[PDB]
Write an enzyme that holds these catalytic residues in place. Structure first.
Site, mmCIF file in Angstrom:
data_model
loop_
_atom_site.group_PDB
_atom_site.id
_atom_site.type_symbol
_atom_site.label_atom_id
_atom_site.label_comp_id
_atom_site.label_asym_id
_atom_site.label_seq_id
_atom_site.Cartn_x
_atom_site.Cartn_y
_atom_site.Cartn_z
ATOM 1 N N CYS C 152 0.937 -1.286 -0.060
ATOM 2 C CA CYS C 152 -0.002 0.045 -0.112
ATOM 3 C C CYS C 152 1.097 1.313 0.146
ATOM 4 O O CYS C 152 0.547 2.052 -0.662
ATOM 5 C CB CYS C 152 -0.856 -0.030 1.161
ATOM 6 S SG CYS C 152 -0.342 -0.406 2.722
ATOM 7 N N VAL C 156 0.381 4.532 -2.341
ATOM 8 C CA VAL C 156 -0.016 5.735 -2.026
ATOM 9 C C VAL C 156 0.934 6.961 -2.647
ATOM 10 O O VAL C 156 0.458 7.859 -2.961
ATOM 11 C CB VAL C 156 0.074 5.908 -0.489
ATOM 12 C CG1 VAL C 156 -0.014 7.087 0.276
ATOM 13 C CG2 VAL C 156 -1.046 5.054 0.110
#
Ligand code: ICS
Ligand code: ICS
Ligand SMILES: [Fe+3]
Ligand SMILES: [Fe+3]
Ligand code: NA
Ligand code: NA
Lengths: 522, 473, 522, 469
Positions: C152, C156
């Site tokens: 993740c 991002v």
């Protein structure tokens, strides 16, 4: 009473207050029950070493046996042959029980017939029963073969099976070419497994003894496989599967896996699969004959060596890691076929499972019972896993076997607290698991009453049952499992490791009491 | 149906040889009053034709004596009989197994060939003593003979007298050798007579039991799944006192007290009418048949039983009826719609082939065929009236016969035993076990009727029956 | 203390009196523990319908999820390709967790790598990690391919994987011919099964999108099979076994069953088996592509239809009787192979088993959870068996899926009391089994804490767990089981029937109390 | 032999590109100015290392049993760490304890776009209505929180004040640091700033001269309960345990103690140094692995007190002597001469060496995932001459060192276990103890011996080779 939206069966219906009070009134009014403190006292006594001494001093009483009579195995052997009917010369009650006993283990039809000998046949024998028997059965159920064994009444009054069958052919009740192998199978000798051996040797000779001039050892390039009394359908299927994977030509003599597993598809098939009469006639032309359960196939062995002239190898039942290995290597030598990559991988996958689970298996103590080949297999594999087979009971075992098992036990560190009992039953086993408590029992359904007694003493004393064996009546479809081969070993290993973990989960489910150890990862 | 039934019977018998076709034809009939004019029964089985019947040892050990909870019953013979019959019959009981009750255990003399040669009588006396040291709380001993005991001339009656006198125990010899008779039926009579001669008289003098005008006995309820507890509770709500249960959950002392009662309630006529006749002759006690299968039969039987007493029992009877009426009407309202119109074939033993008909009819089903393994002609006389016209009656049905009848008649549900179950499941026909209750029940009484109806419904309308045929055919 | 001849582990060591008094001293002196009666009061309350209403009003807090992050399935997918190293661009912590989560389920090695992005990559991006990571990966572990997904973190900050990989080839870190399929797998979207889809479409695109010109539907006379996220070795095998029994040429695209089951024979094999790059390149020439788990293969479906021009058939997951029949009949139409006798028989044995066990399964009420295709397959089969799927929970389900499940349930009498919950978790499920008690739960190892909670309320309130799904951490080797096809249905039926019979045995083991109904025969 | 080991390292590093080969060479040695440690991992090489979230939530905060710990961010991180670490506790999970639950804010794209701070405040309120008996909340930040610019400290302050509850913000984002190591430090600081001081002004705790805190025992298997028992038989009073089976109140009372007993230096020396600065509480390292180390530790701890504690120490030593000697008697013969290669985290690669040697085993290779050069300084003294030392080992390297050294036993983590079992090397898990344990104290030594023995001598290892191969 009943609420129609939640009907209660006997459990828990009879726990309703009105039923509980009635039973209390029944007992106090008319049962003249022994006081409960006297009952608890006698029960505590039955769990003690003193009671165990008296128990093992028994000579005339047997309590909870771990065996059946010979003709139950003669039935299962003959069920293994193509379109053959098992036929049991004697009284009809025995057949009603054989059928039932197998219906509930296999949950399947089991065909067998009787010629319904009664009081009058005692006086002058069952010759007319047999004549009318064979003709009736043959006309009605249309087998290619009828295979004959006896109940204890037939044995005692001295009926001549050979002579009665021949006369039934001389008198024209059945065609002369119609096959009617037979065997004497007396309930008062040995056990269900003996009846298997006797029936098998009966059918081998029927198709073979008079035809040997023509036979040439090895001419058919196949290996004979005699499985014995076998109640797991996966055990027939694994053997066939491994031989085919190595490309060995094999004849499996006595194969009931089709008839004990027909599909539910709108129609009842009395007969299915099975060894052809023809594979039986041509069996002497095989390279060799392997007996998968040698310790109850003594009579068959003497015949295949004496008449077929095969050099039957000294192989143990192929259970666990070493005996499966030795079985494949013996098959490889006899056949000339190498052990293929697929089986070498499956071995290595079994060994991998052993490495992943050894820490939960190590030192776990077991009481176990069953037939002699299967029990020594279990002993061997349990030792290979690092488990301690503490109590080993074989009701139908003998001195020679017990010496072999004790030899196995001495060649390993994990057998040193172990003892082998022959001729002892489940009431003796009850005592052993009170006085020298193991962690589990491995055995058949009758062991559920031993688990129940041990819980009554306390949850700390309970010995949980692991169902492997015959009969299994209180769980469904375990008859489909496998215990032989690397696959069978993988199954037994998985079942033992998870019985262990399940038991541990239960002992650690108590919130804020024992759940500190209720681990997500085991 | 009528001429098609008598047709069907002749097509099936075409397969047999001559001798058996002519015997089997007399044991199949179509219904239309005295069975001695319609069908014959209680005759030996045609060899090799796969009868369902068991033996006199099953009839005596398995059905009559084995349930008696505080006695130890010795299976005297080889290890087979006691093993196949261990815990196979669900004759339920309260007790502490191995200590003061012993119904699900297997005691046995395990005959070897030496015992066949020298006789098993010295083995018996040695085993009676071991029984005594290891099970000190047993209240008596039965010795159920297996096929070989008679054939070799042992004498268990002398072992019983001598050992019984020596230890001051009841030891009951039972000569239920499997080869005696033609069926379980003779086992019933041998066993009843054994109770008469060795047990039932034990308290003829004793009068220390306090009797009441309302004492009764339940005779021939073997408490399958609790069937007899579901009956006792109604009888005691009606004001009566069940002093004895023969033999479901029964104690030997309950049996010794039955001659004190005022009325003998007989559920299973076939297996116990012998002892009931005897208790009427010797002790003056009347007996009646009853039927607690379904609310119509159960209601009728309560009212008939209360009619033998005074008003107060008759008043209480109506109170029992009204208490449970909403309960079985909720059962009917729920399951009769799911079962109405469906046709049943039965094949059981000696009593249920007729006694459960009322409970099927109370759910709107139709018993189109029934038959008994070992009933006598008096059972068939009672069955003629329960069955409808042109229904098929069959005695000691063979395996071939039952399969071929089912193929032509195509019942919606079959009710029979274990040996038949997986046969018809394969053929696609819902089956319910009518001996073991398919490990369910009780089926007796109002509380039993809710379970019977839920059971018949779950099996008849189960989804598995629509899936027998693969969609590729 | 310890007695050397019987050593104690944490259980039951800490139940010894001296440990007991020490824990009581610890609590009373320093924990400042709420008193026991308050703890009881709050526990009772957490079992009530009132508490359940509060619980279902949650919308920010998740308690005990029944799902994981996308990159976990991208790893499992990539593991199914030959000599392929899975490679997760982002932070190393995620890869440590993926590996151990799988290690613990499969009890096998799990190869995956990271490029160890940290704080300084957040600001300037992971371009240098990708260049060094691939070159280091390829040189050290020698994969034929590297399959790239993302943590993740990488998502991002906005790393472009296409660009970073192309640069790495341009700047010579890996050869230009070296395959490096890639997929974005953001953790904050969907779940672990979404990562599987994302990765799979990724690899398909890499090997086929630019090469369509020569491809002809049907030319290779094979069917492609896309399995989706699968953690049962048995489910790969049954699919391949049934298609080989039917004589159907087939390409299982992504196949880990070899890497996840290597033999223990003295050497570690990082890679084994797997779908060949040749198979993926040839896949468009198939007659068609079957998606075994359609409900998490939406993105793959679009690509196989859009670019390959396969007419993907509308099939449910082949679970249970009706859906296995629909799968085989579809396969037969596409391939033109008739369904063989061996499979028609296996079907008939499954029906037989259902017919032998219906009395014990009927009306039994379940709670269950899992991935969407798996859960609707369970639901379907329970309905065929006569069971009632009361609480059906799919944390990663969606409104369309719920509408398909609700239709299945409506089509059956046994769905009347069933509710389907999506986006709910196992703390929600815990209330449902307090307030509307089922008889069992079917789920993964996390349900063991709900069983624990149920028992604390009372033994009559206990809901026992049946472990089917993923992950299963607290039992060994269940990852070897099957759940698809007839074989899988026979396994599930056996487990369920025998879990009902195990429970009834336990409730009726009490001597002179409930053992009137402790039947030998069931 | 030193040079036969120095050429194994060179031969293995031949496979690497130049950048990674030059960095790895400094992380491998044969035994301060010997090895480098606590640097960033080389990309692509399959390290065993975890993140700062594992080191904050999974090791330090998670065990604290009466608090609710929120994994702030997407579902993955809290799920893989649910119940994976065996930090044992006494409690009623779901009402007053919460260690094996997974609370999370389950971030979706919406929260990555608009922020997660309004969601976090709503979650605090929901935790308060559904779990009334919690005694405080911690919020553990996953990779995305830092990177999108959330302000959890403000939420924590504001909500904390609103509800009068301890709510501890922790920025343990996985991308910070190079390992679990930074997570330990970040977690300690979080403890310092938001919990430890809560009782600085309070004076109602009744002290004694024997008060003590166990620092950095996470109670794996019960390890710390089997250490508490001994300390208390010595006459001491264990006011608090950090963080195994620990309660917040026990944390808040630690500044009231006379001595801090640090088991895990790496993970907890930060807070220990702070308590010496502020509260004047001395600290000392101890080691309860095996009897030699446990005796030597008891005596050193007892020496920081009076003659009374020194007596009782000797009564404890003499009580348990017959038991541990029995263990050695039975198991040293079965395990003597066997060699062990260890690879663990920040402490056990050196702390468990005494226990192996008490059973006669030789530790020929050890190494850490995330140690600092102060940890390695301690290790030099415990390791033998010419043994092998490796820092942030790669999968390829650990496989290749094992093939040449051929140890009899390896102890590492789950990610390593199935690799070597396949090779046929006995493997024992030295983080989770393979579900066994405890291993600390005298009681734990009996288990540790039973466990090395059962695996090393298990019949399975003799079977890896098919008789026809
Ligand atoms: S005793 Fe008889 S065969 Fe009357 S031997 Fe048989 S428990 Fe049947 S129809 Mo099994 S005459 Fe009882 C019977 Fe009926 S054992 Fe049960 S079901 S009411
Ligand atoms: S805290 Fe550390 S990696 Fe000191 S992060 Fe790790 S429960 Fe290890 S070597 Mo898992 S510094 Fe504890 C540890 Fe050691 S989780 Fe456990 S085993 S003694
Ligand atoms: Fe069946
Ligand atoms: Fe493995
Ligand atoms: Na018999
Ligand atoms: Na992460």
């Amino acid at each position: 009473s009943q609420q129609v939206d939640k009907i209660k069966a006997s459990y828990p219906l009879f726990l309703d207050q009105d039923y509980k009070d009635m039973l209390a009134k029944k007992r106090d009014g008319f049962e003249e029950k022994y006081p409960q403190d006297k009952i608890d006292e006698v029960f505590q006594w039955t769990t003690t070493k003193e009671y165990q001494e008296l128990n093992f001093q028994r000579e005339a009483l047997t309590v909870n046996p771990a065996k059946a009579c010979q003709p139950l195995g003669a039935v299962l052997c003959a069920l293994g042959f193509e379109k053959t009917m098992p036929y049991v010369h004697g009284s009809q009650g025995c057949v009603a029980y054989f059928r039932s006993y197998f219906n509930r283990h296999f949950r399947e039809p089991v065909s067998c017939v009787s010629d319904s000998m009664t009081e009058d046949a005692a006086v002058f024998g069952g010759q007319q029963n047999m004549k009318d028997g064979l003709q009736n059965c043959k006309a009605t159920y249309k087998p290619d073969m009828i295979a004959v064994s006896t109940t204890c009444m037939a044995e005692v009054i001295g009926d001549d099976l050979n002579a009665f069958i021949n006369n039934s052919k001389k008198e024209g009740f059945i065609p002369d070419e119609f096959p009617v192998p037979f065997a004497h199978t007396p309930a008062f000798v040995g056990s269900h497994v003996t009846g298997w051996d006797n029936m098998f040797e009966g059918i081998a000779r029927y198709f073979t003894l008079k035809s040997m001039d023509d036979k040439v050892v090895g001419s058919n390039k196949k290996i004979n496989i005699v499985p014995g009394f076998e109640t797991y359908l996966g055990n027939f299927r694994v053997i066939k599967r491994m031989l085919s994977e190595m490309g060995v030509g094999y004849s499996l003599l006595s194969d009931p896996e089709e008839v004990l597993d027909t599909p539910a598809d709108g129609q009842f098939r009395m007969y299915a699969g099975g060894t052809t009469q023809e594979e039986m006639k041509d069996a002497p032309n095989a390279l060799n004959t392997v007996l998968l359960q040698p310790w109850h196939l003594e009579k068959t062995k003497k015949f295949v060596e004496g008449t077929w002239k095969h050099e039957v190898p000294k192989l143990n039942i192929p259970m666990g890691l070493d005996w499966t290995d030795e079985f494949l290597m013996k098959v490889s030598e006899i056949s000339g076929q190498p052990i293929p990559a697929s089986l070498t991988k499956e071995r290595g996958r079994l060994v991998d499972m052993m490495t992943d689970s050894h820490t939960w298996l190590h030192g776990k103590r077991f009481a176990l019972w069953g037939d002699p080949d299967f029990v020594m297999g279990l002993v061997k594999f349990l030792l290979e896993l690092g488990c301690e087979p503490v109590h080993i009971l074989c009701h139908n075992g003998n001195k020679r076997w017990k010496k072999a098992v004790d030899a196995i036990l001495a060649a390993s560190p994990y057998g040193k607290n172990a003892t082998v009992y022959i001729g002892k039953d489940l009431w003796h086993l009850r005592s052993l698991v009170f006085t020298d408590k193991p962690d589990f029992m491995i055995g058949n359904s009758y062991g559920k009453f031993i688990q129940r007694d041990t819980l009554h003493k306390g949850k700390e004393f309970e010995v949980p049952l692991i169902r492997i064996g015959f009969p299994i009546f209180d769980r469904h479809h375990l008859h489909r499992s496998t215990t032989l081969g690397y696959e069978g070993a993988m199954q037994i290993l998985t079942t033992l490791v998870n019985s262990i973990l399940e038991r541990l989960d239960e002992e650690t489910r108590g919130m804020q009491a024992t759940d500190y150890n209720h681990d997500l990862v085991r | 149906s009528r001429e098609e039934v008598e047709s069907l019977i002749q097509e099936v018998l075409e397969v047999y040889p001559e001798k058996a076709r002519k015997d089997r034809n007399k044991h199949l009939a179509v219904n239309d009053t005295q069975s001695k004019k319609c069908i014959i029964s209680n005759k030996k089985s045609q060899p090799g034709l796969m009868t369902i019947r068991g033996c006199a040892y099953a009839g005596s050990k398995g059905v009559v004596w084995g349930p008696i909870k505080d006695m130890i019953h010795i299976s005297h013979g080889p290890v087979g009989c006691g093993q196949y019959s261990r815990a196979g019959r669900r004759n339920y009981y309260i007790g502490t197994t191995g200590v003061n009750a012993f119904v699900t255990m297997n005691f046995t003399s395990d005959f070897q060939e030496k015992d066949i040669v020298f006789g098993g009588d010295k083995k018996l006396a040695k085993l009676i003593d071991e029984v005594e040291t290891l099970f000190p709380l047993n209240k008596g001993i039965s010795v159920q003979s297996e096929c070989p005991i008679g054939l070799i001339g042992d004498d268990i009656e002398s072992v019983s007298k001598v050992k019984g006198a020596e230890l001051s125990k009841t030891i009951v010899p039972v000569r239920c050798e499997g080869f005696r008779g033609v069926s379980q039926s003779l086992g019933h009579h041998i066993a009843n007579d054994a109770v008469r001669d060795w047990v039932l008289g034990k308290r003829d003098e004793d009068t220390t039991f306090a009797s009441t005008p309302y004492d009764v006995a339940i005779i021939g309820d073997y408490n399958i799944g609790g069937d007899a507890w579901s009956s006792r509770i109604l009888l005691e709500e009606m004001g009566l006192r069940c002093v004895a249960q023969w033999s479901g959950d029964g104690s030997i002392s309950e049996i010794e007290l039955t001659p004190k009662v005022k009325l003998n309630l007989v559920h299973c006529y076939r297996s116990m009418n012998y002892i009931s006749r005897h208790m009427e002759e010797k002790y003056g006690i009347p007996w009646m048949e009853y039927n607690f299968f379904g609310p119509t039969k159960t209601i009728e039987s309560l009212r008939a039983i209360a009619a033998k007493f005074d008003e107060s029992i008759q008043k209480k009877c109506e109170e029992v009826i009204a208490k449970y009426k909403p309960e079985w009407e909720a059962v009917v309202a729920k399951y009769r719609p799911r079962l109405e119109g469906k046709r049943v074939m039965l094949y059981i033993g000696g009593l249920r082939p007729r006694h459960v008909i009322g409970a099927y009819e109370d759910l709107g089903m139709e018993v189109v065929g029934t038959g008994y393994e070992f009933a006598h002609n008096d059972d068939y006389d009672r069955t003629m009236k329960e069955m409808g016209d042109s229904t098929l009656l069959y005695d000691d049905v063979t395996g071939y016969e039952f399969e071929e009848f089912v193929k032509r008649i195509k019942p919606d549900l079959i009710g029979s035993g274990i040996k038949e179950k997986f046969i018809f499941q394969k053929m696609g026909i819902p089956f319910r076990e009518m001996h073991s209750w398919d490990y369910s029940g009780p089926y007796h009484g109002f509380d039993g009727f809710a379970i019977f109806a839920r059971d018949m419904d779950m099996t008849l309308n189960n989804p598995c029956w629509k899936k027998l045929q693969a969609p590729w055919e």
